[PDB]
Amino acid sequence: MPSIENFLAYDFWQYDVIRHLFAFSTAVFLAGLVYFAMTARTTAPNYRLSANISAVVMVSAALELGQLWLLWNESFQWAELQGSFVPVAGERFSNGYRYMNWLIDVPMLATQLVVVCGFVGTELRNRWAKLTIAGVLMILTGYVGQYFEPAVAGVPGYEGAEQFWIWGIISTAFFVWMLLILANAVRNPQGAPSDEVRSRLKFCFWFLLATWSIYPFAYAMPLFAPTADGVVVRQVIYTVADVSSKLVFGVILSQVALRRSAEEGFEPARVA
Ligand SMILES: CCCCCCCCCCCCCCCCCCCC
């Protein structure tokens, strides 16, 4: 179904800002690829998977925001007499498109935290399995919910506003399940981590919780019946969430993985 973005006209500034958010984000994630490539070589073999997962998330995210950039350009047309970008008939832009690549991002971001906690073999795979089940169900139920956001925003001729709350609350339950799995992981790190590593692992959990929590906030923006300006704010919120949850989290986690590597006597990690 059409997202709230589809029912508004945008002045040049509003349209161009949002276009730049998508382009800039794509470029930043691609650049992140270089950092994770370099950091992988200095990480111990037992923690290198985390850096590799960050690379997978950067490519997933680049394609996410790349697609939003293309859909944004294709879904609106300059109307010279109005001096505004107006929605094209038969072309629907939706943030809902981002949900598909979340199927990669969410389980992977969760799993890489578990990897740096130092879980291996069956214990790692059990947690990956549970995080993938919870994560996929969170995203699918969320997707059903956001399908009805036009009705929530009071866009005339749209119904099913209750679906937004039903499936939103269901999705939130799956989110909490994921957070409880991860809380358990960071509370019970494997090996003999320093007090510094234990504290930094908990930091990583709470940073994931904080940045992930922005996504339900962006989900809820239709409640505020936004104008074009509110849509700009919503896409800024998503950009902060995307860059913080994927790249900044990735960098912070990579530094904990390097510390664990150094503590365990991996020389290239000590040198770095
Ligand atoms: C110290 C190691 C040497 C430096 C490595 C840095 C090289 C860059 C990272 C490698 C990634 C290149 C793979 C290209 C695929 C990108 C996908 C494009 C999506 C649109």
Numbering used by the authors: 1 to 272
Study text:
In order to resolve details of the internal organization of ErNaR, we crystallized the protein using in meso approach and determined its structures at pH 4.6 and 8.8 at 1.7 Å resolution using X-ray crystallography. The crystals originally appeared at pH 4.6 and contained a monomer of ErNaR in the asymmetric unit. The structures of the rhodopsin at pH 4.6 and 8.8 appeared nearly identical (RMSD of 0.06 Å). The retinal cofactor is in the all-trans configuration in the resting state of ErNaR. E64, a unique characteristic residue of ErNaR and Subgroup 2 of NDQ rhodopsins, is pointed towards the RSB and interacts directly with D105 (D116 in KR2). As a result, a large Schiff base cavity found in the ground state of KR2 in the pentameric form is absent in ErNaR and only one water molecule is found in this region. The distance between the nearest oxygens of E64 and D105 was only 2.1 and 2.2 Å at pH 4.6 and 8.8, respectively, which was extremely short for a donor-acceptor distance in a normal H-bond and strongly suggests a low-barrier H-bond (LBHB) between the residues. The E64 side chain was also connected to the second aspartic acid counterion of the RSB, D242, through a water-mediated H-bond chain. In this case, only a minor spectral red-shift of ErNaR upon pH decrease might be connected to the charge redistribution with the counterion complex including the D105-E64 pair reflected in different lengths of proposed LBHB at pH 4.6 and 8.8 (2.1 and 2.2 Å, respectively). In contrast to KR2, ErNaR adapts the N-out conformation in the pH range of 4.3-8.8 in both monomeric and pentameric forms.
